[PDB]
Each structure stands twice: as structure tokens, then as C-alpha cells.
Design an enzyme around this catalytic site. Structure first.
Site, mmCIF file in Angstrom:
data_model
loop_
_atom_site.group_PDB
_atom_site.id
_atom_site.type_symbol
_atom_site.label_atom_id
_atom_site.label_comp_id
_atom_site.label_asym_id
_atom_site.label_seq_id
_atom_site.Cartn_x
_atom_site.Cartn_y
_atom_site.Cartn_z
ATOM 1 N N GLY A 205 19.500 90.470 -2.357
ATOM 2 C CA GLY A 205 20.076 90.883 -3.642
ATOM 3 C C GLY A 205 21.056 89.898 -4.268
ATOM 4 O O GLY A 205 21.055 89.635 -5.516
ATOM 5 N N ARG B 87 28.146 99.993 -2.403
ATOM 6 C CA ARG B 87 27.804 101.204 -1.624
ATOM 7 C C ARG B 87 28.908 102.231 -1.766
ATOM 8 O O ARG B 87 28.616 103.426 -1.905
ATOM 9 C CB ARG B 87 27.524 100.920 -0.122
ATOM 10 N N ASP B 88 30.175 101.787 -1.774
ATOM 11 C CA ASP B 88 31.228 102.772 -2.029
ATOM 12 C C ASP B 88 31.224 103.286 -3.474
ATOM 13 O O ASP B 88 31.445 104.474 -3.686
ATOM 14 C CB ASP B 88 32.616 102.474 -1.449
ATOM 15 N N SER C 130 7.697 93.704 2.728
ATOM 16 C CA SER C 130 7.926 92.836 3.842
ATOM 17 C C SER C 130 6.618 92.489 4.574
ATOM 18 O O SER C 130 5.779 93.351 4.816
ATOM 19 C CB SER C 130 8.862 93.569 4.789
ATOM 20 N N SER C 131 6.446 91.230 4.952
ATOM 21 C CA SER C 131 5.275 90.813 5.760
ATOM 22 C C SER C 131 5.027 91.764 6.955
ATOM 23 O O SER C 131 3.887 92.072 7.292
ATOM 24 C CB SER C 131 5.523 89.412 6.346
ATOM 25 N N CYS C 132 6.097 92.194 7.626
ATOM 26 C CA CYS C 132 5.929 93.062 8.787
ATOM 27 C C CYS C 132 5.330 94.449 8.565
ATOM 28 O O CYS C 132 5.285 95.289 9.448
ATOM 29 C CB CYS C 132 7.171 93.073 9.682
ATOM 30 N N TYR D 290 9.932 101.756 9.870
ATOM 31 C CA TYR D 290 10.366 100.976 8.777
ATOM 32 C C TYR D 290 9.117 100.624 7.921
ATOM 33 O O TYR D 290 9.174 100.601 6.691
ATOM 34 C CB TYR D 290 11.043 99.704 9.357
ATOM 35 N N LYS E 157 8.283 101.511 3.878
ATOM 36 C CA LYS E 157 8.000 100.460 2.893
ATOM 37 C C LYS E 157 6.672 100.681 2.219
ATOM 38 O O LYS E 157 6.587 100.733 1.019
ATOM 39 C CB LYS E 157 7.989 99.084 3.538
ATOM 40 N N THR F 106 7.620 86.787 3.087
ATOM 41 C CA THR F 106 7.440 86.356 4.494
ATOM 42 C C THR F 106 8.837 86.341 5.204
ATOM 43 O O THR F 106 9.801 86.850 4.633
ATOM 44 C CB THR F 106 6.784 84.952 4.610
ATOM 45 N N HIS G 140 16.506 87.219 14.759
ATOM 46 C CA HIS G 140 15.836 86.324 13.809
ATOM 47 C C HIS G 140 16.096 84.907 14.238
ATOM 48 O O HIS G 140 17.270 84.524 14.443
ATOM 49 C CB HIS G 140 16.275 86.605 12.326
ATOM 50 N N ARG H 270 22.875 79.058 17.943
ATOM 51 C CA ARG H 270 22.770 78.500 19.294
ATOM 52 C C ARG H 270 22.948 76.956 19.382
ATOM 53 O O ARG H 270 23.728 76.436 20.208
ATOM 54 C CB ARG H 270 21.487 78.961 19.997
HETATM 55 N N1 LIG Z 1 12.707 88.759 6.178
HETATM 56 C C1 LIG Z 1 13.452 89.806 5.623
HETATM 57 O O1 LIG Z 1 14.448 90.360 6.093
HETATM 58 C C2 LIG Z 1 13.188 90.242 4.149
HETATM 59 C C3 LIG Z 1 13.521 91.480 3.533
HETATM 60 N N2 LIG Z 1 13.333 91.616 2.163
HETATM 61 C C4 LIG Z 1 13.481 92.833 1.464
HETATM 62 O O2 LIG Z 1 14.831 92.973 1.086
HETATM 63 C C5 LIG Z 1 15.317 94.103 1.773
HETATM 64 C C6 LIG Z 1 16.744 93.795 2.116
HETATM 65 O O3 LIG Z 1 16.831 92.599 2.916
HETATM 66 P P1 LIG Z 1 18.143 91.833 3.043
HETATM 67 O O4 LIG Z 1 18.603 91.287 1.692
HETATM 68 O O5 LIG Z 1 17.941 90.879 4.168
HETATM 69 O O6 LIG Z 1 19.173 93.004 3.552
HETATM 70 P P2 LIG Z 1 20.660 93.127 3.342
HETATM 71 O O7 LIG Z 1 20.937 94.078 4.423
HETATM 72 O O8 LIG Z 1 21.217 91.747 3.435
HETATM 73 O O9 LIG Z 1 20.697 93.770 1.976
HETATM 74 C C7 LIG Z 1 20.533 95.189 1.852
HETATM 75 C C8 LIG Z 1 21.677 95.755 0.987
HETATM 76 O O10 LIG Z 1 21.483 97.176 0.736
HETATM 77 C C9 LIG Z 1 22.761 97.748 0.640
HETATM 78 N N3 LIG Z 1 22.521 99.115 0.947
HETATM 79 C C10 LIG Z 1 21.819 99.666 1.974
HETATM 80 N N4 LIG Z 1 21.894 100.982 1.987
HETATM 81 C C11 LIG Z 1 22.615 101.294 0.830
HETATM 82 C C12 LIG Z 1 23.035 102.522 0.259
HETATM 83 N N5 LIG Z 1 22.800 103.698 0.856
HETATM 84 N N6 LIG Z 1 23.761 102.505 -0.884
HETATM 85 C C13 LIG Z 1 24.059 101.298 -1.402
HETATM 86 N N7 LIG Z 1 23.830 100.069 -0.893
HETATM 87 C C14 LIG Z 1 23.109 100.143 0.243
HETATM 88 C C15 LIG Z 1 23.530 97.093 1.782
HETATM 89 O O11 LIG Z 1 24.919 97.370 1.740
HETATM 90 P P3 LIG Z 1 25.858 97.768 2.872
HETATM 91 O O12 LIG Z 1 25.797 96.767 3.975
HETATM 92 O O13 LIG Z 1 27.188 97.923 2.202
HETATM 93 O O14 LIG Z 1 25.293 98.856 3.760
HETATM 94 C C16 LIG Z 1 23.120 95.631 1.521
HETATM 95 O O15 LIG Z 1 23.903 94.989 0.571
HETATM 96 C C17 LIG Z 1 14.366 94.322 2.954
HETATM 97 O O16 LIG Z 1 14.359 95.703 3.138
HETATM 98 C C18 LIG Z 1 13.006 93.747 2.554
HETATM 99 O O17 LIG Z 1 11.945 94.500 1.970
HETATM 100 C C19 LIG Z 1 12.687 90.705 1.450
HETATM 101 C C20 LIG Z 1 12.362 89.469 1.996
HETATM 102 C C21 LIG Z 1 12.577 89.264 3.379
#
Ligand SMILES: NC(=O)C1=CN([C@@H]2O[C@H](COP(=O)(O)OP(=O)(O)OC[C@H]3O[C@@H](n4cnc5c(N)ncnc54)[C@H](OP(=O)(O)O)[C@@H]3O)[C@@H](O)[C@H]2O)C=CC1
Ligand SMILES: NC(=O)C1=CN([C@@H]2O[C@H](COP(=O)(O)OP(=O)(O)OC[C@H]3O[C@@H](n4cnc5c(N)ncnc54)[C@H](OP(=O)(O)O)[C@@H]3O)[C@@H](O)[C@H]2O)C=CC1
EC number: 1.1.1.271
Lengths: 314, 314
Positions: free
Chosen positions: A14, A34-35, A105-107, A134, A138, A162, A177, A185
Site C-alpha cells: 500500500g 487501522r485506528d 497472490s501467486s500462492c 488464506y 483471496k 509474484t 521470506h 542473515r
Molecule cells: N508476496 C506478497 O506478500 C504479496 C502480497 N500482496 C497483496 O498485498 C496484500 C498485503 O501485502 P503487504 O503489503 O505485504 O502487507 P502489509 O501487511 O505490509 O500490508 C497490509 C496492511 O493492511 C493493514 N490492515 C490489515 N488489517 C486491517 C484492518 N482490519 N483495518 C485496517 N488496516 C488493516 C495493515 O495494518 P496494521 O499492521 O496496522 O495491522 C497493513 O498496513 C497481500 O494480502 C497480497 O494479496 C501483493 C503482492 C505480493
């Protein structure tokens, strides 16, 4: 000036979209923490959309984690993910938000999908158990999008990234990861004069990686295509679009490249007494390229810049 | 008019020999591309020598690479190199080619050789693991030469070049070679107004560099000496001849000199938190000088002209 809500704008993905969007004058970003806004709470979610005048939504909030987490809290990963996506998509439709980008997500592809995996591999077979809850959430997310598109004529698009990496990843050798685990490491070993670093496995398996900044660019490019061009390139019941390089690289290559990025002078060693996973895992990105988008960051370049971020934030 | 086959005439080293040779009327060059002639294929190699009437061979074809490559494809580096050299040397003998120049490499010497390294340091101890497969193939190459010289009375000579640089190098900050890596880095920084450029390490370690055009001159001088003078200066089981300047220069000196060559006005910075390699690495070139050859290009001059080539070919 389009009004853009990037849900989960502080997550890894994001926050990357937010950086690019930020330099756009044709965009007004609407963000909440989130808050400030719990996305699990439908009413709250509904209130927000009912009071903010949104044009586009980038759905980057999710409950994401590694192998140990997915295996330890399977209910949290399926539930939270189903609600977050249900809440958002529904509230958006109800407030006449016509444009949305869903992130998969690829997974989510089957365990034994044919490689490289085209979009049509979805649902063709059994899933990896570690990711199963998960994955199901998705896929449900994607089928919501297609459903609204179908019944109501909305424009709710999807991308399947990916393996990704970059700023704001979790840089712990504690993390499931490889890149962040390995960057950390090799860093510590380099600092402690470790004579070697051992990686479980043969190193022969092939995998794909994409810098999160390319991921962000690809998402915005996809969001912003004209509807007609997007339809031409998808099917309403097969709407997603893989996002990646479509190029393999072995774990050995990865490790040795990281070693060189960190300035490590010890020995990289593979313990082949440990099992490997499948030999090959990567996306077919023909659709994406056809829609005219090609990634820009080399692994080598991306790893270098990613290590400096870690250096600037440890 | 001697008939000269320069194997791998388009490589960095080969192409340099070709340039000098080209201005020689006492020479007729016979050249083939990899598509015109795969050197791994013995039959093909044999056919060529069986149909071309060759007098001298400059063995400049090889499977060469950086740290990441040597560590990622160790089988390719040992195998290809053993075959290419076996194929050529054998076919040459069989077609009564009496003169050949084999190319080795400084990195074939032991990890802790005594500095500066005389030719007698070969095989005196353990090798650097990153280069080990490749080194073994090269040493095998040299011992083939000596063997044919010994059993059949041939005139198959050898030179061990130091670190080289110049036109047709791989100019990527992606490359494990400092000069091309640094020439490229300072270039980009200079263009982006980078306030600084950081180089891992203290900068204190000493290394040796030679412009590829000197390398080419030295090779031809060595090839063309009279047999009697060459024998006088070698031993049949210690036949190689180091090629270099025999002069040290620290990485700091190198970097700052490159900085000045590129017109960079930012700050050169060393991150001493990163480990250094050994303190000193260089060839003893007493033999060469005794045979009457002394390099001509200053580092400074060589770097300047090398940067212009990069400018004329980026
Ligand atoms: N290889 C991978 O990991 C990839 C994932 N993505 C997609 O992006 C998604 C997120 O990945 P990534 O950016 O790594 O994850 P992050 O965990 O880095 O980002 C997820 C965000 O969601 C916020 N969030 C989660 N639950 C809530 C909620 N209830 N209310 C408000 N905010 C919330 C989190 O905030 P807080 O921590 O404050 O809980 C955090 O900022 C994955 O689910 C996937 O589909 C896409 C490409 C690759
Ligand atoms: N510091 C160093 O790097 C030095 C190396 N050398 C010696 O010279 C060798 C080559 O170095 P360098 O000039 O930098 O390397 P290059 O890679 O620049 O040259 C090698 C050449 O060999 C050709 N070649 C390789 N395999 C085959 C094959 N199967 N059939 C035909 N052509 C083939 C390559 O062609 P293609 O790309 O088409 O595959 C290429 O033109 C080294 O192995 C070393 O002993 C000497 C001094 C220094």
C-alpha cells in the site's frame, strides 16, 4: 481530481502505491489508519464510504504472514481476509464506487500448476495446505469482484503479484521470506566475520521475485487502463492479471547475489541434506505485457536499493 | 604469411589481439564465430583444423564470468573450459600446428601465495573457492601444453594475465570487476548529481591492473620470441609467464582516480564496516621483463581511453 482510497496504505504494498500516487496532481488520496478505521467493522466501513466521496479504491489491506503464522492462526487468515474484502467491496458498490483494484497472490494457484502459471491455472487443482485458508479467502475476493462486475456492471479489477520484496518488508531472519531473511542473515554474518552462512537445500529450485515498486507501478497501470482495452484482454469469469517478471532464478543465484550485495566475503553453503520444494514456480505474464507493461527493476538493482533501506531503517 | 587462428576473436582479450594483428602484413588471420564454430564440438574443431592450414593459434576462447556466475554455475566453468582447451590443443597437434599461445589467469594461484607471486607459486597451495573449478580447468590447460611440448616437442606457450580492463569489458555496476563496475557507477552518479558514491571496504587493499592492449602486445611478443630464448627463460614443467605491471595500487587510489577520470565532483566514501580481502595481490613479472617486455599504458591513461570507449558504446 480523482478521489483515491488506498486501503492499508501503510502496508508494504500500500505504502508503495501511495508513494507513486503521491506525485500525481490528478489524484486526491484518502487514507485512514487501522485506528482511524477498522476494516473488519462493516458499519464503520459503510460510514466511511457513505461520507467520503470516493472514485477509486486500491484494496491493499490484508492479514498477511509467513509459514509459521499461516499454520498457527488459520482462522484469523481466512476470517479477517473474508471480512475485509466483503466489507469494502460491498460498501463501495453501495456508494456507487465504480473502480477498484483487488490484490491477490501467486500462492493462490494450485500446488502442481503447470509452469509458468497462466491465469487459467486458477482453481485447477489442490492448494498448498500452509496457504489454503488464506488462498480460499483471496479467491473469494476475486470472485466477489467478478460477480459485481457481472451483475451490476462495475469495474472491479484484479492483479496476482509474484513473490515481492522491498522497503517496509519484515527484515528478520525470523521471517519465512527468503530475500528479507537472507538480506538480514548475510548482513549479520558480514558484521560478525562469519566464515560461512548455511542455507538448507540444494539451491537448485527456481523462483520468481518482483520489487514492490514495480508491483505498485503495474497496479496503477492496470487500474488506469480503459475499460474497453481491459475487457478485450480478460474474461469476466477469468478476470485477474498475473504481475511479475516471468523469469526464473535459482535459490543459489539468489543467495550468491545477495552475498555480493551485502559485501559478504565468507562462504555461501547449501545443506542438501535438507529437502527442496518444487523445482519451479513462476507466473506467465503474457497478458500483462500484452496490455503493455514490463517490469523495470533488475533483481540486482532492486536488492541493492532494498538493502540500503534496511540500512537506513534498522 | 603466417596463418593465425585467434580463437574467441570477439572476446575482450581476443578482439584486442586481432586489432594488433590486423595491422600485420606478415599475418593472415583465420577467424570463426561461435555460430560458425562451436569449440566444444571436437569433431567440428577437428574438421576445421583438418581443412584450414593453420600455423599459429592464440587460445582466447573461454567461458569467463564474475563472482556470482562462478559460484552459480561451477559445472559450466570447469567443463566448458576443459573441453575447449582439450579440443583445440589436440586438433592442433594432430594437424601439425607447432605454435600456440595459451591464456591463463592470475586467479589460478593459491589463496595465500607469497606476494608478489612468481610463476613458481602455482600449485603451491589451496585455491580461492569461488574460482576453484575455473582454476582447475586453466591449470589443466597449462599442463596439457607442457605435456605435448614434452612428449612431442611442440611449441605451446602460456601467459598468466593479471586483472585486465579496457574496451569490450562488461560495463555494468552489475559486474564483479571493479574498474568496469566503478567506471559505470561514477558515470551515473556524475550524471545524477549523486552527492556521494559509497564503496564497501576500507580501501586499503593493494591490487594490480593491466590495460587489455598491453595484454595483447605482451602475448604477441611472447608468442613471437625465438624458441631458444623462450626455453632459456622457462622450464618445461614451469613454462608459464606472468603478464602485468608488477605494481600495486590501493582500491582508494583506484576509486579516486576513476572519480577524477569521469569528471565526478561528489564525494568518494569507503564503508569500512565491510570486510576487505587480502591486503595484497600482484604478479612478479621479472621473467617477462627479462624477455624484454615492459607495459606501456599508465592506469590513468588507460582508464581515460577506456571511459571514452564506454561513452562511444553505451
Ligand atoms: N508476496 C506478497 O506478500 C504479496 C502480497 N500482496 C497483496 O498485498 C496484500 C498485503 O501485502 P503487504 O503489503 O505485504 O502487507 P502489509 O501487511 O505490509 O500490508 C497490509 C496492511 O493492511 C493493514 N490492515 C490489515 N488489517 C486491517 C484492518 N482490519 N483495518 C485496517 N488496516 C488493516 C495493515 O495494518 P496494521 O499492521 O496496522 O495491522 C497493513 O498496513 C497481500 O494480502 C497480497 O494479496 C501483493 C503482492 C505480493
Ligand atoms: N582478467 C581477466 O578476465 C583475463 C582473462 N584472460 C584470458 O582470456 C580468457 C577470455 O577472457 P575475455 O577476453 O575477458 O573473455 P571474453 O568472454 O570477452 O572472450 C571469450 C570469447 O570466447 C568465445 N567463446 C566462448 N566459448 C566459445 C565456444 N564454445 N565456441 C566459440 N567461441 C566461444 C566467446 O564468445 P561468445 O560470447 O559468442 O560465447 C568470447 O568471444 C580468460 O579465460 C583468461 O584466461 C586473460 C587476461 C585477463
Amino acid at each position: 481530481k480523482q478521489r483515491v482510497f488506498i486501503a492499508g496504505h501503510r502496508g508494504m504494498v500500500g505504502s508503495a502505491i501511495r508513494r507513486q500516487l503521491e506525485q500525481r496532481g490528478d489524484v486526491e488520496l484518502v487514507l485512514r489508519t487501522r485506528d482511524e478505521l477498522n476494516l473488519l467493522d462493516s458499519r464503520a466501513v459503510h460510514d466511511f464510504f457513505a461520507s467520503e466521496r470516493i472514485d477509486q479504491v486500491y484494496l491493499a489491506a490484508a492479514k498477511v504472514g509467513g509459514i509459521v503464522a499461516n499454520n498457527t492462526y488459520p482462522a484469523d487468515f481466512i476470517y479477517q481476509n473474508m471480512m475485509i474484502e466483503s466489507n469494502i467491496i460491498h460498501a463501495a458498490h453501495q456508494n456507487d464506487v465504480n473502480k477498484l483494484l483487488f490484490l491477490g497472490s501467486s500462492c493462490i494457484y494450485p500446488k502442481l500448476a503447470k509452469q509458468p502459471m497462466a491465469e487459467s491455472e486458477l482453481l485447477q487443482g489442490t492448494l498448498e495446505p500452509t496457504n489454503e485458508p488464506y488462498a480460499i479467502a483471496k479467491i473469494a475476493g476475486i470472485k466477489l469482484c467478478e460477480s459485481y462486475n457481472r451483475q451490476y456492471g462495475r469495474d472491479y479489477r484484479s492483479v496476482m503479484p509474484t513473490n515481492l520484496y522491498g522497503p517496509h518488508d519484515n527484515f528478520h531472519p525470523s521471517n519465512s521470506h527468503v530475500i528479507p531473511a537472507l538480506l538480514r542473515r548475510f548482513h549479520e554474518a558480514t558484521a560478525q566475520n562469519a566464515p560461512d552462512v548455511v542455507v538448507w537445500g540444494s539451491g537448485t529450485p527456481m523462483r520468481e521475485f518482483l520489487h514492490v515498486d514495480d508491483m505498485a507501478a503495474a497496479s496503477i497501470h492496470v487500474m488506469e487502463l480503459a475499460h474497453e482495452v481491459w475487457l478485450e484482454n480478460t474474461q469476466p469469469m477469468l478476470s485477474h492479471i498475473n504481475v511479475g517478471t516471468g523469469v526464473d532464478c535459482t535459490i543459489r543465484d539468489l543467495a550468491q547475489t545477495i552475498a555480493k550485495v551485502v559485501g559478504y566475503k565468507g562462504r555461501v553453503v547449501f545443506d542438501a541434506s535438507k529437502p527442496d520444494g518444487t523445482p519451479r514456480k513462476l507466473l506467465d505474464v503474457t497478458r500483462l505485457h500484452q496490455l503493455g507493461w514490463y517490469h523495470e527493476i533488475s533483481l540486482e538493482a532492486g536488492l541493492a536499493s532494498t538493502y540500503q533501506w534496511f540500512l537506513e531503517n534498522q
